[PDB]
Amino acid sequence: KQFVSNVSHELRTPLTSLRSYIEALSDGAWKDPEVAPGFLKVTQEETDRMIRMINELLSLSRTRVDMELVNINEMFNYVLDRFDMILKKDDNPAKYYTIKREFTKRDLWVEIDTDKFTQVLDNIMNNAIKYSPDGGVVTCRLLETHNQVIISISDQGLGIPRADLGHVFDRFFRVDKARSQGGTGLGLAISKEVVQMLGGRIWVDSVEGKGSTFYISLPYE
Amino acid sequence: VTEQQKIDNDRKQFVSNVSHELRTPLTSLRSYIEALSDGAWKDPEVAPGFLKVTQEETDRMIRMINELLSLSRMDSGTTRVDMELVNINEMFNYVLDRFDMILKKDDNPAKYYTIKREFTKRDLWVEIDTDKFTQVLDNIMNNAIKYSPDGGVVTCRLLETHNQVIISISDQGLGIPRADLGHVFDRFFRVDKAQGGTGLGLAISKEVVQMLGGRIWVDSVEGKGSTFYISLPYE
Ligand SMILES: Nc1ncnc2c1ncn2[C@@H]1O[C@H](COP(=O)(O)OP(=O)(O)CP(=O)(O)O)[C@@H](O)[C@H]1O
Ligand SMILES: Nc1ncnc2c1ncn2[C@@H]1O[C@H](COP(=O)(O)OP(=O)(O)CP(=O)(O)O)[C@@H](O)[C@H]1O
Numbered sequence: 001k002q003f004v005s006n007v008s009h010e011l012r013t014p015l016t017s018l019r020s021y022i023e024a025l026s027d028g029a030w031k032d033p034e035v036a037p038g039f040l041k042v043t044q045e046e047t048d049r050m051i052r053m054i055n056e057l058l059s060l061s062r063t064r065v066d067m068e069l070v071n072i073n074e075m076f077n078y079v080l081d082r083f084d085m086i087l088k089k090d091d092n093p094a095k096y097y098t099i100k101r102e103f104t105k106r107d108l109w110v111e112i113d114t115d116k117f118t119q120v121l122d123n124i125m126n127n128a129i130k131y132s133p134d135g136g137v138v139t140c141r142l143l144e145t146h147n148q149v150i151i152s153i154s155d156q157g158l159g160i161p162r163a164d165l166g167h168v169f170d171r172f173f174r175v176d177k178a179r180s181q182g183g184t185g186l187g188l189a190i191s192k193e194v195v196q197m198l199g200g201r202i203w204v205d206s207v208e209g210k211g212s213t214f215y216i217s218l219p220y221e
Numbered sequence: 222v223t224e225q226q227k228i229d230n231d232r233k234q235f236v237s238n239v240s241h242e243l244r245t246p247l248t249s250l251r252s253y254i255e256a257l258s259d260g261a262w263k264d265p266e267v268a269p270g271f272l273k274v275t276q277e278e279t280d281r282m283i284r285m286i287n288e289l290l291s292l293s294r295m296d297s298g299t300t301r302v303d304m305e306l307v308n309i310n311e312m313f314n315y316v317l318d319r320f321d322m323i324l325k326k327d328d329n330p331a332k333y334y335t336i337k338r339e340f341t342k343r344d345l346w347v348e349i350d351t352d353k354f355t356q357v358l359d360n361i362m363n364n365a366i367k368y369s370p371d372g373g374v375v376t377c378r379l380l381e382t383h384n385q386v387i388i389s390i391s392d393q394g395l396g397i398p399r400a401d402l403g404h405v406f407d408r409f410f411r412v413d414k415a416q417g418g419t420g421l422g423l424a425i426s427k428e429v430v431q432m433l434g435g436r437i438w439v440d441s442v443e444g445k446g447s448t449f450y451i452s453l454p455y456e
Contacts, residue, residue, distance in 0.1 A: 001232055004239055005293045008286050011243070015286065018250075019279045026272045030262055040258045043275075047250050054247075058240050172299075184290075184299070 003061045013122035014046045017082045020089040065113045072108045079121045096135045103142040116194045123187040132157030133180035151216040159208030246278040288421040304348040316358045340379040357426040368394040391448040396441040
């Protein structure tokens with residue numbers, strides 16, 4: 001049943017991603033030859049991914065990671081692409097949310113599990129938007145230093161209490177204050193151990209009035 | 222130890238069912254997406270039709286995920302319930318008012334239905350969670366409307382006894398087999414239909430009503446109709 005809670009949570013980003021592209025296609029993009037095949041490709045990939053997700057989360061209930069060498073620039077770019085589409089077909093005024101990308105010009109190659117790591121990126125990107133009720137710009141950086149590849153995601157949202165910067169990675173822990181709104185508290189806990197499974201590190205810095213920055217570090221080579 | 226056994230076995234089939242039930246819309250989706258990708262997107266007489274179906278399968282899964290989440294919070298005691306003293310007469314009336322309002326707008330209604338109200342005349346004040354309890358009434362009212370003949374009457378009663386507040390909602394449909402009066406509240410139990418409709422509604426409603434300290438059950442005679450009951454402890 002821990003299966004049920006986890007799969008319910010983790011299916012939310014792909015379903016939202018899937019619906020956004022379907023609505024874009026439905027809104028008229030299906031008539032447009034230079035975008036429709038690309039959009040359809042994303043829906044096909046997200047649908048297949050959700051099926052891969054359902055089966056594996058059920059098997060875990062009975063150290064299963066699929067490591068491949070990946071170009072993080074391209075993947076993170078792909079992940080952000082899905083969120084851009086989400087934001088363009090959302091209920092909010094255009095430019096109410098913005099994803100700013102600041103990637104290094106180098107191509108960074110890292111050993112990760114593509115499906116499991118995507119879940120991590122989805123959770124944090126979801127958080128950055130969801131806890132930015134008054135809108136905001138999300139800043140996503142990608143760089144390598146000291147043999148580590150580092151991803152950072154910054155928001156102009158609500159902050160995180162300094163006392164709770166450690167607790168946000170705990171399972172079912174949610175910040176107990178009021179917003180301008182919250183769910184289970186499973187996102188960052190799940191996200192943390194996937195990063196730890198990949199040999200990485202995750203941490204957060206925040207100012208309670210202006211926003212937060214989450215960090216992921218992965219082994220380079 | 223058949224106790225812990227039955228607990229562990231109910232859980233295993235539920236989990237299997239959730240795997241199967243989430244897998245099915247996605248597989249349908251995959252087929253439509255491949256048809257579109259294989260070339261149907263270029264075709265104006267099928268592409269819009271296909272896209273709508275994919276949208277519905279997606280929407281249905283979102284309703285499923287949300288319902289699976291309500292059940293998981295309930296299954297863990299994470300659910301936050303707020304018992305407050307409210308006028309049940311007025312609340313039930315508002316629920317019925319909103320359903321009445323829907324039918325009074327002519328989107329060439331699929332099926333015309335009538336709601337007869339038989340409320341007690343004393344005003345009943347009770348501790349409940351209005352938001353969660355309203356959800357239950359909608360679920361039963363939706364069912365009552367969905368499974369009633371064309372021109373049928375839905376009978377909504379509110380009555381009190383020394384120790385119980387009783388709400389009953391009756392439909393004039395084909396009813397429910399005596400063997401399935403308990404089973405209709407089980408998770409994923411739905412009429413044989415092989416889009417929409419999860420079969421989690423009454424399961425959620427049973428656990429919400431039980432959460433509020435109440436009781437829910439159904440009586441039916443095949444061919445004549447069904448009556449659903451909600452009992453809440455009075456004063
Ligand atoms: N950018 C941000 N700004 C402010 N608070 C944040 C934040 N990112 C996370 N948090 C807080 O830290 C906690 C992280 O827990 P987690 O994200 O697992 O809960 P959750 O899964 O219910 C969020 P969601 O419903 O969007 O998936 C949240 O309760 C949230 O309040
Ligand atoms: N008033 C009624 N009369 C006859 N059968 C009913 C009924 N209410 C429910 N049922 C049957 O019991 C099962 C459980 O109903 P429930 O309302 O939980 O399904 P659901 O969650 O998909 C909402 P809906 O069926 O209105 O879309 C359904 O499959 C339905 O066939």
